[PDB]
Design a protein around this nucleic acid. Sequence first.
RNA 1: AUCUGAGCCUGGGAGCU
Lengths: 48, 319, 255, 31
Amino acid sequence: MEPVDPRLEPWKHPGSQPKTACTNCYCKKCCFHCQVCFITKALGISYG
Amino acid sequence: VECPFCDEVSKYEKLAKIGQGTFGEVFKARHRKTGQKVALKKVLMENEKEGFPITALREIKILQLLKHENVVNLIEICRTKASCKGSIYLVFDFCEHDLAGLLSNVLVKFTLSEIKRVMQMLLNGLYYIHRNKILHRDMKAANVLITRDGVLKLADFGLARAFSLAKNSQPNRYTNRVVTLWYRPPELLLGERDYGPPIDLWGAGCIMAEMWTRSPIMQGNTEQHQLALISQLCGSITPEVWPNVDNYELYEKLELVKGQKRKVKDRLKAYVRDPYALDLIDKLLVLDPAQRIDSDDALNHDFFWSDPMPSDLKGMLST
Amino acid sequence: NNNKRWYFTREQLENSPSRRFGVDPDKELSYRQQAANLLQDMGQRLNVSQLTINTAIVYMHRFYMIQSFTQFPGNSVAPAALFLAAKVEEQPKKLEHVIKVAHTCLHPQESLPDTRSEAYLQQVQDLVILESIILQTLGFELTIDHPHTHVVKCTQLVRASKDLAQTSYFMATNSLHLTTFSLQYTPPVVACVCIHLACKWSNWEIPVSTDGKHWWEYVDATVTLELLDELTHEFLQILEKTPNRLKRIWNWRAC
Amino acid sequence: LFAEPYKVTSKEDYLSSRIQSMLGNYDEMKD
RNA sequence: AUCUGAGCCUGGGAGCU
Ligand SMILES: [Zn+2]
Ligand SMILES: [Zn+2]
């Protein structure tokens, strides 16, 4: 979701963990919380 | 179990062992059908604590990236059929000689011109890998190869890694305990973790001295002993000669001899003789890495542009 | 023709290793999307860089152009690929930590197996095996270039707003998760498709430079507007099958 | 050396219109 | 009354072949 400056070396890139924990609500706020939520909630793809 | 992009090493026939590498055994081998010679470097997956070693992943990445006339060439990566487990082999282009072997052989005689050419190719390689943001971190005579045609190749990148010029901000914390003790620069022995390309050029200076001494110039037995030898030869490590060396946690905790004056030229005069050579060695073995000469400055040094100009090695190698 | 090794034509994609074993095109693409989602989840729990996840996804996409899902399940290959990418991208994670996170993700009911149990050491052996198979299948070609690099560089060049940069990067990630462009078109082309799509969505329009050339001309010399729109159509076509909950959840609830 | 992007008041592009009628107004998803 | 996986969604599970 959040851009990362490509000129950073691989060991410098920030971690992907979102600041807030993922919920199970499917409201607008919750469907774009992070990549996982978007793929699972908004686009309905799940492995389980 | 399909595997189209990783041939079995069986295609090569091992001929002999040729030393122990950073993480494996190395064998000379020839392609069974074409006779092409290669060097098989066996990835020793003894450190099964973290699976495939990151050291080998870095080496493979780097050697897939670096392509230069003075950098060893990776051909492919081969496997073994599960017998009772598998192993990976790095396949390199074979080089007839290594610098250590040549320096130990008494029948091999270097002219000054040929030493100039060796150091020129060496610094070209260091210049190339440094401009591609790669540190070698294992510069030593045994890792400098010379082909039959007298083309120098930097080799054994098992300890190499990429580095950053990052970023006027959070400094890097690289792996400190690197480089063979004899060729290790002062800053690494004092616990520096934000070092850079200069450490490789320290090794180049040590190697350049061996071109005349035919023997490693500082054969320490411990990190402290090595530091003492460095102080004895290059002078005492002091803020006066190395600004901000105070800041090293271990600068006083280790106690470094303080009296020693610099004796690089004094002690090497009898072996090197050439004035320009001595000057370049003096600039390569500077204590403070911030003041140590870099590949480009070394390659513009008068040593490389004064008579006798560098010449091809082919001559000296046939003896 | 060594470039075209890991880039394929529709004829080559249609005759996938999974097709050889009777796996519908849509079902293979589904397994790919699921593997990508699992990789993203594990990566976010491990707190690795997005670069690591993207590399793991490209590994997965290329892995399944040689091996079949019949033989190697996506839910077993994915943790190995991520464990490898973490090393390749200079952010290595302990094997214990990865197996833990994978169990948490795939068995939220079960308790995290004991580090001494025979089953845990079996999971370890399986993971290390899969890592070796992924490495050999890919020919140890571990340097991956991603669309995100060129997307971000281009958004910087054209002085895009924060929202347009975010959206372009987001579409780049979606391109890796939902499509097989990484196996069809070069990273610069995908970057252009992503920026173009983000612009068409946001109604941002990127003008011509002070020297009279369109923005896509500064990213790749082969990107024509015709092929650009064609591949945007291919993207949206790959997106039509998505259970478009959005058209339905579009206007309902908040927090 | 590069004019900032500029909106297109009432976009009509078939591709843009289809994407938007699909997703749901970029200005909305800001929340 | 219990198992199984499968497909459908819907302020999300103890709902349906
Ligand atoms: Zn989330
Ligand atoms: Zn909510």
